[PDB]
Design brief:
The PDB classes it as immune system. The complex is a heterotrimer of chains A (168), B (9) and C (161). Chain B has 9 residues and is largely without helices or strands. Chain B is 0% helix and 0% strand. In chain C, strands 2, 6, 7, 8, 11, 12 and 13 form a seven-stranded mixed β-sheet that branches. In chain C, strands 1-3-10-9 form a four-stranded antiparallel β-sheet, with no helix packed on it.
């Protein structure tokens, strides 16, 4: 049974590097192309890279071209994505997926995905001359608002749950 | 395989 | 680049009702070699990857209920659900799989219209309770991740002394 497992996901410094890998099993690895596809916090899906079965052709969209390298090791049944010059907008769940080299039907097989979070160079520049006092006040402002946003989600969910619990 | 296979897209 | 416009963005439904989703593409998705439209439709539920639902525009994947039908050609594509079930509540994405760069639509989300639950099976009601739990916890965790992201540069700036 076909199985894809991503790893490597982590917090990255502004402009930093990171390498993801994806362990393949339950099929003959060397006979299929592979891809990476990412999903951003807004839920949009974006194709990141594709590799041929033999490793000799690679493809990238303009958004990551020059920065991202897709590779594979057919002996180790492992797909790789090496990322450079990462920016906050590269924050996403990264999925590896099989390329259907025979059927050509899109992505039938996806792994569970690995989270990559990239720190903003811009956000860092913005705080350059803030004092500890300035920063503490800003910091302390967040959690009270997070709590209220969470409370909205919970209340809405329970309002959908309660009518069902009442029927049962 | 004697040849690699390009992506179909 | 080929752009895919999915409408509506969300759609409130009642169980049993027919639903219709639209994917319009800026360019043709005809694979000239074999005359099939390489458009794929996916279904995504909270905590999991997109699931392939329909390929070559109109061919149902194995194990997909026949209440899902894909159709259209050229630029205008539709996904129809003849009789929608609470288990079909999800985000639906179309994808250009014909030419680089591969591109996805922005998604059409199906939601339940807010009594009438008397006409549902106890099975379908328990299934909805089970689906609600990971949906709410993912929404909550996405809020925690967003606020980690807002906190991070401030904690980085405090530490950098």
């Amino acid at each position: 049974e076909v199985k894809l497992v991503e790893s490597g996901g982590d917090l990255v410094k502004p402009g930093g590097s990171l390498k993801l890998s994806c362990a393949a099993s339950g099929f003959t690895f060397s006979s299929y192309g592979m891809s990476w596809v990412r999903q951003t916090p807004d839920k949009r899906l974006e194709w990141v890279a594709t590799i041929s079965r033999g490793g000799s052709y690679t493809y990238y969209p303009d958004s990551v071209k020059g920065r991202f390298t897709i590779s594979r090791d057919n002996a180790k049944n492992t797909l790789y994505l090496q990322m450079s010059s990462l920016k906050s907008e590269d924050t996403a769940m990264y999925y590896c997926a099989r390329r259907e080299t025979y059927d050509e039907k899109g992505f039938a097989y996806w792994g569970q995905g690995t989270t990559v979070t990239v720190s903003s160079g811009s956000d860092y520049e913005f705080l350059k001359s803030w004092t500890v006092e300035d920063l503490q006040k800003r910091l302390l402002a967040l959690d009270p608002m997070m709590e209220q946003e969470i409370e909205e989600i919970r209340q809405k969910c329970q309002s959908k749950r309660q009518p069902i619990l009442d029927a049962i | 395989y004697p040849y690699d296979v390009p992506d179909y897209a | 680049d080929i752009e895919l416009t999915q409408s509506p963005s969300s759609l409130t439904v009642t169980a049993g009702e027919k639903v219709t989703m639209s994917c319009k593409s800026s360019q043709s998705l005809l694979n000239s070699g074999n005359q099939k439209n390489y458009l794929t439709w996916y279904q995504q539920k909270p905590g999991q990857p997109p699931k392939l639902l329909i390929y070559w525009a109109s061919t149902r994947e194995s194990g997909v209920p026949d209440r899902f039908t894909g159709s259209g050609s050229g630029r205008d594509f539709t996904l129809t659900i003849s009789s929608v079930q609470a288990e079909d509540l999800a985000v639906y994405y179309c994808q250009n799989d014909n030419s680089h760069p591969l591109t996805f639509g922005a998604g059409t989300k199906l939601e339940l219209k807010a009594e009438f639950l008397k006409s549902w099976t106890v099975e379908d009601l328990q299934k909805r309770l089970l689906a609600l739990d990971p949906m709410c916890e993912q929404e909550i965790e996405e809020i925690r991740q967003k606020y980690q992201s807002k906190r991070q540069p401030i904690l980085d700036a405090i530490e950098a002394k």
